[PDB]
């Protein structure tokens, strides 16, 4: 069986075989598509070995050693660990291969042309939150590279019984605080108000500014999470100015240079790495500075539209569209000026099409979530919009996982 | 499973869907693969390639008539049981059956209601149905279509309408509108490789020229109608210009913009789809409404032979076109869309921006979950092609499923037509 995807702009047709090797649900059924559902839906010995066999088989396939004496001994060595300890341990080579291929397999990620150049930090000897703070600080310093950003992941110890989990409670490593005000207004980032309250409650003393870098909330071995302040010299930041509007800088805006997802789960061969913060660089449109509040009533969108003298009465003036472009121009120009890595949504989508076609040639396909590959603006004038895409779940993978404050059973009285 | 929740991640509104339990035909997805971004993911028809036996057509007929009499709170009534027997005898003796006028109107409106890709469905029950099943020639089709265009255009106060030509019998006597839309601009392939006019319509324009049409080879040449009746060779017809309402595009602030000499037509009227009711296949069913401003593809239009209207507008805007990160396509795209809305409104021609249209669709979705138990919707097509994340539908989850009656896609007639 062979499935085809067409590009309705170029007429190119790619033939997908890789989809034959997927295994877990998309969420869709034969009669319902869930393509626009965000989340649609501890291992025993008998579940774990088929999964381990799967991953090991594919790793040894990837290094042209399938069936080799080294392959069969590894499989036997894994079987013994699982039989003895109800789990097993990845070699360093397998950990690297697996983390790299989880990114390769991430169908919602447009930046995968870079997947093979991922720096993997093995943190499976970490035992304490302080060690997590040490590992994470070294990640940040390395990834940031004085603005010449570099992809990296840091992998903390895997799940055991589910009661000794390692978790980064932050959703990203660097985010700005959000405070809801008595009058209902919001200071800082509205997207982070709930996590900020958790931190304040844990004892964090909030500066109550507008761009307060949140503290790290780190959990080792299933213990209560602990607060740590990232050293400010390690948080690279870009003041936002517009190349044409000299007034734009006066909005007072900045963003952090390094995007670093820390709340997802890395699954390799049936092992779950509940803390695996990974970082790349931004596509321009991801930066949500739009949702800040300049005054007590207006968005940065509304404020930018105001200062542009836009007719903000009727929607059909497209003032919201107009201001959105300008904010994105400013974000891109600002990063580029400060020589901090960033990619515009045109450059990223074009490279993704090149990557997708090359993945079909060497790999037999490339799972892709069109709902997520298409940028949040100017969708149809980017090349992915007319690109058909097949979505399926390959493993290794990154997976969503519950927020730790909904499941953590608190230790100390 | 039992009931499927959908969530709006801006408002946290959760709707609970049970209507999907009445889904008939495959989406193309499996547990393991999703085809949500394939244009035509499935070929799961409800009946074989042409004239079907009774056991193939009647179950389809029964289900629709059942649903129609349920719709009006009969079911099991004298009229309902009598109608089933009428459809039965009719298939026994002609291998098909004929919808009542009530049945035809209900099915048309519910094929619109069920169009999971259509953001305009808030208005679904306000649809004017023109029964043209007595038509027998291309001239008759040309007359029917002409009256559709006049009624729907309504001097700019556009009204939704559908004209329904005779159903397919054996597949050899099809009625077909060979145009994809009733009004479209021609696309000429220039001997140097660039295109003049609308590049989306180059093939069809060449098909018309090949059929005897004389291209004016001007700028905005309305394509003739290529009308096929009863399976005969199709015929060319020129829509009277006074019936083709056009809006000159100017810009509210850029005065140079009108000097681009651009214009678009007011009436979008899809004419190449197939309407399917109770097993019957109406292969000629042109329908029309009014444009969402983003749909007007004037940006790809080539007046010159060097530059899109997009890159042309960017030149007049003095935009840094050196690299992409200036976002010059983004900026020009907004201005062009500002210009289009402004002109349609200035000339009193009905149009809707993508914010109002998407806001309306969320209202529609709520109603549909409140009364019907759900609403099928294709996120890949409901989200507008610009500024997606600032419209309300971006953050709305949707369930896609195929309900009948529906509008289906169908091969371009020239692939499958043998000439008399
Ligand atoms: C190197 C530059 C990268 C770029 C430009 C990039 C770009 C993007 C974008 C734009 C999204 C969509 C998220 C949104 O729209 O809010 C995304 C998703 C994602 N990316 Fe990448 N990414 C990069 C690197 C990485 C790396 C290094 C990894 C893993 C090691 C990764 C894994 C993912 C995952 C798992 C998602 C899905 C997130 C979710 O489902 O919530 N990405 N990426
Ligand atoms: C009255 C105003 C209407 C508006 C604003 C509207 C809006 C839209 C839009 C924006 C699309 C996306 C297509 C694209 O962007 O290329 C669409 C698709 C569609 N519309 Fe509506 N529409 C309207 C009326 C109607 C009517 C009256 C019918 C039929 C009775 C209809 C049936 C459809 C169908 C079947 C599709 C799917 C097209 C396909 O699969 O290619 N629409 N509509
Ligand atoms: N540079 C880089 C580098 C590495 C990783 C990334 C990706 C960061 C992803 C952060 N986690 C994204 C997210 C999670 C949950 C909700 C979100 O917003 C709500 C929402 C709702 C509906 C959507 C429909 C389509 C679509 N495409 N997005 C939607 C988002 C975002 N980036
Ligand atoms: N006012 C109104 C009123 C009634 C009806 C309409 C709709 C007019 C539709 C005309 N038929 C346009 C069309 C059909 C098929 C393909 C097209 O382009 C290719 C393409 C490829 C991938 C896509 C992915 C997502 C997406 N949303 N579109 C895609 C389009 C255009 N309008
Ligand atoms: Zn699907």
From Swiss-Prot, chain A:
Ligand binding (L-arginine): 172, 281-282, 286
Where in or outside the cell it occurs: the entry states: Cell membrane, Sarcolemma; Cell projection, Dendritic spine
Describe, from its UniProt entry, the tissues in which this protein is expressed.
Answer: Isoform 1 is ubiquitously expressed: detected in skeletal muscle and brain, also in testis, lung and kidney, and at low levels in heart, adrenal gland and retina. Not detected in the platelets. Isoform 3 is expressed only in testis. Isoform 4 is detected in testis, skeletal muscle, lung, and kidney, at low levels in the brain, but not in the heart and adrenal gland.
Subunit: Homodimer. Interacts with DLG4; the interaction possibly being prevented by the association between NOS1 and CAPON. Forms a ternary complex with CAPON and RASD1. Forms a ternary complex with CAPON and SYN1. Interacts with ZDHHC23. Interacts with NOSIP; which may impair its synaptic location. Interacts with HTR4. Interacts with SLC6A4. Interacts with VAC14. Interacts (via N-terminal domain) with DLG4 (via N-terminal tandem pair of PDZ domains). Interacts with SLC6A4.
Q: What's in the domain note?
A: The PDZ domain participates in protein-protein interaction, and is responsible for targeting nNos to synaptic membranes. Mediates interaction with VAC14.
Task performed by this protein? Produces nitric oxide (NO) which is a messenger molecule with diverse functions throughout the body. In the brain and peripheral nervous system, NO displays many properties of a neurotransmitter. Probably has nitrosylase activity and mediates cysteine S-nitrosylation of cytoplasmic target proteins such SRR.
**Name of the protein this chain belongs to:** Nitric oxide synthase 1
Which species is listed as the source? Answer: Homo sapiens
Question: What gene codes for this chain?
Answer: NOS1
**What portion of the full-length protein is represented by this chain?**
304 to 722 of 1434
């Amino acid at each position: 069986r062979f499935l085809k995807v067409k590009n309705w702009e170029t007429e190119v047709v790619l033939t997908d075989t890789l989809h034959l090797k997927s295994t877990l649900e998309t969420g869709c059924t034969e009669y319902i598509c869930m393509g626009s559902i965000m989340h649609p839906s501890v291992a025993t010995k008998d579940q774990l070995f088929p999964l381990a066999k799967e991953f090991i088989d594919q790793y040894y396939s990837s290094i042209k050693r399938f069936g080799s004496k080294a392959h069969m001994e590894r499989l036997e060595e894994v079987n013994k660990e699982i039989d003895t300890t109800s789990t097993y341990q990845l070699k360093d080579t397998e950990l690297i291969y697996g983390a790299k291929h989880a990114w390769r397999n991430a169908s919602r990620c447009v930046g995968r042309i870079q997947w093979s150049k991922l720096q993997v930090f093995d943190a499976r000897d970490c035992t304490t939150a302080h060690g997590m703070f040490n590992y994470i600080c070294n990640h940040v310093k390395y990834a940031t590279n004085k603005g010449n950003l570099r992809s990296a992941i840091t992998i903390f110890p895997q799940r055991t019984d589910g009661k000794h989990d390692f978790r980064v409670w932050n959703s990203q490593l660097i985010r700005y605080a959000g405070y809801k005000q008595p009058d209902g207004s919001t200071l800082g980032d509205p997207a982070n108000v709930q996590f900020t309250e958790i931190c304040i409650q844990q004892g964090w003393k909030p500066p109550r500014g507008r761009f307060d870098v949140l503290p790290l909330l780190l959990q080792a071995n299933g213990n209560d999470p602990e607060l740590f302040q990232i050293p400010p010299e390690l948080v690279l930041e870009v003041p936002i100015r517009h190349p044409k509007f000299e007034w734009f800088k006066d909005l007072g805006l900045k963003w952090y240079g390094l995007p670093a997802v820390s709340n997802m789960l890395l699954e390799i061969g049936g092992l779950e790495f509940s803390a695996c913060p990974f970082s790349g660089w931004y596509m321009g449109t991801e930066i949500g500075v739009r949702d800040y509040c300049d005054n007590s009533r207006y968005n940065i969108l509304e404020e930018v539209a105001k200062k542009m003298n836009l007719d903000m009465r009727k929607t059909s003036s497209l003032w919201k569209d107009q201001a959105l472009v300008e904010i994105n121009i400013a974000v891109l120009y600002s990063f580029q000026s400060d020589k901090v890595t960033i990619v515009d949504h045109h450059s990223a989508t074009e490279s993704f099409i090149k990557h997708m076609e090359n993945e079909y040639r060497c790999r037999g396909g490339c799972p892709a979530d069109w709902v997520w590959i298409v940028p949040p603006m100017s969708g149809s004038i980017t090349p992915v919009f007319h690109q058909e895409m097949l979505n399926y779940r390959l493993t290794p993978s990154f997976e969503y996982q519950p927020d730790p404050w909904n499941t953590h059973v608190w230790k100390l009285v």
